[PDB]
Ligand binder design. Structure first.
Ligand SMILES: [Ca+2]
Ligand SMILES: [Ca+2]
Ligand SMILES: [Ca+2]
Ligand code: NA
Ligand code: NA
Lengths: 410, 411, 410
């Protein structure tokens, strides 16, 4: 549902900035769209043919950036919207990139691992002249992973020499960054610390409920727990657990790790996962699916803060119902941006030919997230708007300023 | 345009102090490459105008060439060659890894609409993109150009060689420009003055100051002096001048100037003839706006014991000798105002590293480079038994000669 | 010499890791081997013709790296062995390079300084397309120096633009790094500090005997002395000096820069240089020749620690005898790796366009040597082997794992 959410947010932000109508149309037209044939021999010799693609939306603020999806469902308009969302998101946290999105229309469960490698190399052979370290830097996405990126790196480097910075999300052995897996969860916590400091409160003052215990949910709960937060309720798709004292997340992660369901963790009480969103607590954090907060449950939300860790968790309905209940909402486009920020740091480390240790990675993540919250809050004063429009006007205005500085003559 | 005559004198004096071989000297004088190119554009009404762009690339033994782009009608080649050469010594004095270049277009930018300036800048870039580059020659603003010009150079250059933020410096902050660029020259003057006064066991707070000029350099230098307990007793704008025997609240004066206040109106002092600032009774004199201001007449009448040359070439040769025989220590322009090119190097470094620095780090590095440079100059003065000006020119000249001789001469 | 040791170490390590024989065969085949004609006119105008060469062994972890030898004796077997050692060695200290080794079969004593410059520029003209800042980075070796690297830099840059990072060992004026002279000796001491910390001891608790007083011996002794170590015996080629309370290394370095032979030192008693290895100390540090620990003298060694600062000081019979006696041996491939680590830092500083101060160089040297020891020790625990196999399995496995991540499809 990124399509309708990004278009509404762009439109509302554009109207706040008063963007000139002809600049807006240019900003909406992608820099370049590419489709290429990817034919490979299967392991038995016979042929399969797919179409690979790359939408390169904008590069006014620097090289394009975004994921590669190996997925059968390819809608050109959703891909355009995701690339465009990367352009705004990078500008919100002031990393020097524009947005792109690409992939191949295939089902990776139909392909062996040798076939996946051959497909990835042929894709790279078909697009290498269109990507690059200062041109367009791919990353994992639905259906791809760090091993995919190793194959892209290896094949790209035959055409342009050894180029570690041409992709992010690489394995550690080949130039990947430390702290990549925790970065989104940890960034969520850094961002909430900045928000709470605006009221002179800190994380150790609050109770939290967390919906989803995936990559973001586990790391976000770890970071809250180590900073003195009381996590009082944790949900995932199966079961859920609560504890008004605060759940021992350290123990809960160990329990999940040894193949344990939440519902049978001894350090809490089993609860219905459908009751998580309306749990009694200070802060709610959706980390699972989007659109879970609508107008049927919005008035029932007990939290006074919503940290949008998942993408698009609250719809327009709830956004207003909660806004007049006094609930402050920290928007997805900013709050979960620790991922793209550390992927930038990976690219920096490769460019500088010298890796950072993990303390340095987390030190800069915190600097970037804190500085972005202050820029957002400053915009909310200038335009007297909520934090979601502070964020979008910030990124949109930064892309517009760079576009206008660069000019239009040939 | 004393830059021609002054750069030539100083090179000759320094070369003799070093005893440079005459064949090496000849090579050092010949620029690496001189380029002129046709730049023709359609005006807003479609009619054609034709200009000649140029780039003098003087020397690259110590690294990529570096220098400004001038949109100015006067384009004497001997002067453009001298400016490029001066940049080769200046980068060497502060030990940043560049050589010298200078370029421009023979045009008057007041004849050109803003769209015509852009087309002209883009065509100029089309004609020289193969001659500049991150590790080859890095242009910068100068008379008639600014950060907008640099953005256009960047935008057009990147069409030919890919996104290349480091190909120009002086970029807008939004396109990879560095923090602390604007204060860099004035702030650097103060760092250099602190290092000079440490040789006497004195400090900026021990002194009173007269500052000539309230432009980019004068304002920031006065602010840095004032925040270090220095007493600024006289400031000279182009329009007026202001006085105070006990110090001018530079902070309030900055507020007055910002709200469009003429210097002679600032209530926290009283007026002064600006044509008399150079002979104010002060410990330190800092010319900032204009050069050529100290000649055979005013020389014996100067009061200060120190002259910090923030402006370019403010001291005539005649005045250099007369002031020296009066015991006046002159911190030379080629070093004193080098903060600008030094921070332009840091901008290039930040672009190269793909990761910007905060302003604290920029200024820490600026202080380290200016301080090390003064220590190296002072050491040369001790080695060669010369004043600070020859200390600087021998340091820079020697560094370029050493790099040249290391690289060698076989094909 | 180096050939026999490297081959043995490789097989033992491969057997420990259980490397697949097909992978092993690939790992042993060099990526590329090059021979080029190098003809120049002599100062008198007549022609001499030489053969230049470059063995590029492996680049799965990054650009190849290694010395250029101007030497009449060209053994392709040992050239291959040295390039391959560089591949394992860089992996041991987690430096992002592979191994290469090159040279020109000539006697530099027959050539004037202008003829040497012409030979170096012509060699560069013949291999410029095969080397590069991210492809293969040469360095000094026997018969070449920093002036030689200056010529490679100047000629290479005519073809690919100003490229400071294409060679290391450059003059300081042309982008060379600080800290290079002390780097190997100081690295030896850093590595020895890390080992003793595992037993809860300090440098100040030990007595040391040091064989050899060249670049490595002088800096190693200087650094041991500063950290509180008692250097009770020092030998060179012409004699040796002893002092049970400790030799004043500072005063010994003064006497040596005054062209004073060791045995004429007033702050010690002259001993037989051939009794250094069996001198009564806690720690032996060979810094002169290889093979000086053989099956004859190995049983007489009284030190409980041997720090291999020289290349290949103990043959394998001595390894076995000293192990039974409880001697712990810090292996050469790790202990003396400070040289190649600082050369990496020179490349890093060039790539970043901004040089470091010597304090930062030595700070990073310490971080790298200390991390490598920790990685080595961890490996000794998994495979339950001595430190020497801990080091070779660590580096071998890093090259294997990078090779396997990159894959084999075209
Ligand atoms: Ca020349
Ligand atoms: Ca013509
Ligand atoms: Ca032939
Ligand atoms: Na028109
Ligand atoms: Na001759």
């Amino acid at each position: 549902n990124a399509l309708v959410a990004t278009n509404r947010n762009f439109q509302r932000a554009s109207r706040i900035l008063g963007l000139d109508s002809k600049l807006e149309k240019s900003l909406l037209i992608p820099y370049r769209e590419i489709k290429v044939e990817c034919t490979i021999p299967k392991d038995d010799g016979s042929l399969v043919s797919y179409v690979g693609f790359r939408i390169q939306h904008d590069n006014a603020r620097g090289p394009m950036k975004g994921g590669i999806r190996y997925h059968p469902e390819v809608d050109p308009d959703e891909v355009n919207a995701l690339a465009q969302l990367m352009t705004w998101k990078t500008a919100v946290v002031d990393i020097p990139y524009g947005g792109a999105k690409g992939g191949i229309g295939c089902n990776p469960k139909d392909l062996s691992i040798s076939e996946l490698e051959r497909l990835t190399r042929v894709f790279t052979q078909k697009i290498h002249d269109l990507i690059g370290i200062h041109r367009d830097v791919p990353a994992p996405d639905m259906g791809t992973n760090s091993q995919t990126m190793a194959w892209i790196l290896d094949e790209y480097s035959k055409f342009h020499g050894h180029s570690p910075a041409v992709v992010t999300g690489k394995p550690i052995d080949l130039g990947g960054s430390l702290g990549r897996e925790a970065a989104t969860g940890l960034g969520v916590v850094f961002a909430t610390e900045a928000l709470f400091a605006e009221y002179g409160k800190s994380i150790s003052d609050m109770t939290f409920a967390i919906q989803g215990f995936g990559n973001v949910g586990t790391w976000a709960a770890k970071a809250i727990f180590e900073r003195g937060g009381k996590v009082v309720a944790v949900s995932d798709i199966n079961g859920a657990i609560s504890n008004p004292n605060g759940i021992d997340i350290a123990a809960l992660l160990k329990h999940k790790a040894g193949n344990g369901s939440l519902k049978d963790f001894s350090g809490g009480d089993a609860m219905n996962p459908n009751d998580l969103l309306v749990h009694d607590c200070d802060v709610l954090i959706p980390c699972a699916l989007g659109g879970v907060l609508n107008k049927e449950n919005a008035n029932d939300v007990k939290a006074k803060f919503i940290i949008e860790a998942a993408n698009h968790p609250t719809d327009p309905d709830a956004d207003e119902i909660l806004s007049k209940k006094g609930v402050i909402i920290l928007p997805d486009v900013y709050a979960n941006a620790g991922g793209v920020t550390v992927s930038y740091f990976e690219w920096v480390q490769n460019i500088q030919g010298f890796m950072w240790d993990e303390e340095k990675v987390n030190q800069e993540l915190k600097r970037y997230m804190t500085k972005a919250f202050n820029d957002i809050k400053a915009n909310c004063k200038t335009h007297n708007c909520d934090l979601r429009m502070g964020a979008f006007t910030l990124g949109l205005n930064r892309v517009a300023r760079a576009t206008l500085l660069r000019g239009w003559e040939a």
